[model samples]
Target: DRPRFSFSIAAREGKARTGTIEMKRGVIRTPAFMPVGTAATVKALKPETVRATGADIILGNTYHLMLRPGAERIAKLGGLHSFMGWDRPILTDSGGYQVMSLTKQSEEGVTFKSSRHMLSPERSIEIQHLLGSDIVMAFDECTYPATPSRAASSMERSMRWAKRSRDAFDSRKEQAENAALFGIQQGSVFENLRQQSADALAEIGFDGYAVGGLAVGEGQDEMFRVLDFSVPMLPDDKPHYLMGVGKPDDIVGAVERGIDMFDCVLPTRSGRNGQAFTWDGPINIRNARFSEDLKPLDSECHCAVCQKWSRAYIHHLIRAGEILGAMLMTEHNIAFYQQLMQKIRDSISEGRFSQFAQDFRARYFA
Candidate 1:
């Protein structure tokens, strides 16, 4: 049943669509939210727990993996899935973004520690392959808003790097046939540049395409503006991914704009900091009002944390700096995200995504 990778749309409501991505690892439902597992773990929660939250896939951080145990070592220890104890599908970053941001960058590649650790596009692919990533992203320069002057050059360099990434991927015939590689489009906020970048990527081609360079400090309006013009330029059949995208409202908005896949750390990270997302937006568990209030974190949530624990107990745990507070909160936040994605998919399938979005947003922001 496995023939490389295939994405099929089953239903459509406006720009939003419901579908499934059939891969060797498993079938990932469309409008999927892949929790970020920076160091092969989704932080605070186990893989089975993450799967229980309805996540079909998780993301691995190439930068951290290569830096820590080393990709070569992980491959020797039996690959990332076994190493991390998660057998589900895993998408890995190219390490380009983190390397460029965290280390020094040059024309050849990003250097972490002398020439021995230079992270070129080919090197990035090799490392991801070593980790046995199900979905791999092409190496591209992730420019921030303050670096407008370097946008064009970075975009062009990324295109070249993407080509190298593909070549590296194809070089390994076994990995190429088993896994899928996605090309990333980077042009900052310029529609013309975005068009050019899209056209270039289309020419190079990929199993999927990603709209990168946003979510780096751009407001929602600016991000949406770019997606408005950038998304449609990519092929319709392939999946459109918005990398490192945001809160519940942000995910909903991007899904409405035709984005099919997303990954972010907001849910888990915020949870550790005592923040919990709800149908009515986010709440701080440290708030004194919750100390005596006998209510679930979110009445709409059916997660174990919400179903069994009261706000009062959770507030007390956080106040005492108990580890369980972070665990429960993280689990609930992840659950909330999965629930939100499920609603989005269902609304699209039922042909009422717009109405669903309107109702959800009004209630959330009210």
Candidate 2:
């Protein structure tokens, strides 16, 4: 009786499975990686350093909180998890990728040509239930590079706006009794229009199932060839998010092509610029060959800025512009992407995630 949402896989290896997504405020795990608080802040760290970098969940920005201090002013100031004090899980995003390319899509939704504001689909799930979202993202429209008649007229107007965002998230019965609604699956690469947008979002039933428009820039072999045929055309027991994918080898090749959720800003926009993700790949701690070579920006980081700073003191605190060098390099790239999803759920529980994605892509493509 304590589940507004649930999904439990336990483990698998070949197509990478490891799961757990209870919901009602905790238990996320599953090849997970959210950290993109956008405006409710994950910007310079601290929601207790993003849950001490083992983040259970974090992603909120219904178009930057419905155009700043909106969403009925954070539900009269007690929503958005105590108005951004971060009480744990929070997954909003229903502003249809920030007002569907800024104008004109008259299926009775999307209008904002810089504040003419409209965003329909039942006002994007009533502004993701006035921003208390535990995981609610149904509003669609994310057409990119598509061209089979404009990705079949933009996936049949995003399946008629995902049946009006599942009838406005089931007419908000206390926001569907503690939230849970996800149904994106657009048709950019077009596998039979992503199986007719996953059979019109499994005939409009959803508690999770996103795969929207392949990281907008495509290329991770065309987003793993549209997740090897649109992630098994939905329903392998829910939970398969994958929007705004990444570059920790595109979240280890979209978690070996099964995908159990992800949200990305590229490790807080590459740790506020001077990049850093390592085990030997992304480094540029203000280059100059680590000025004085004191090492440890990622001597296999354990984070307290790789245990007490020094790649010569974070390259002299980002060359003295020091705001604690963007809060210790965005808290070691959000604690090395939640310790690389806890070694990708312990390499899919010892079955060896294909030799840990072949040694995590040869030391992250050294």
The model with the greatest lDDT is 1
Per-candidate TM equals 0.97, 0.34
- Model 1, 1-366: lDDT tens digits are 775688999999878888999999898999999999998889999999999999999999888899888999999999999999999899999987777556567777877752247788888899999999999999887666645557888888899888989999999997898999999999899877788889889999999999999888889999998899899998888999999998899999999999999999999999989999999989999999899978999998988888899999999998999999999999999999999999999999999999999999999999
Model 1 steric clash total? 0
Residue-level error in angstroms, candidate 2, position 291: 13
**Which one is best on TM-score?**
1
Candidate 1 residue spans exceeding 4 A from truth: 113-116, 146-149
Query: In order, how many clashes per candidate?
Result: 0, 0
Residue 343's lDDT within candidate 1 is 96
TM-score quality measure for candidate 1: 0.97
lDDT per residue (tens digit) for residues 141-180 in model 2: 7666757998888789989989888887887799988888
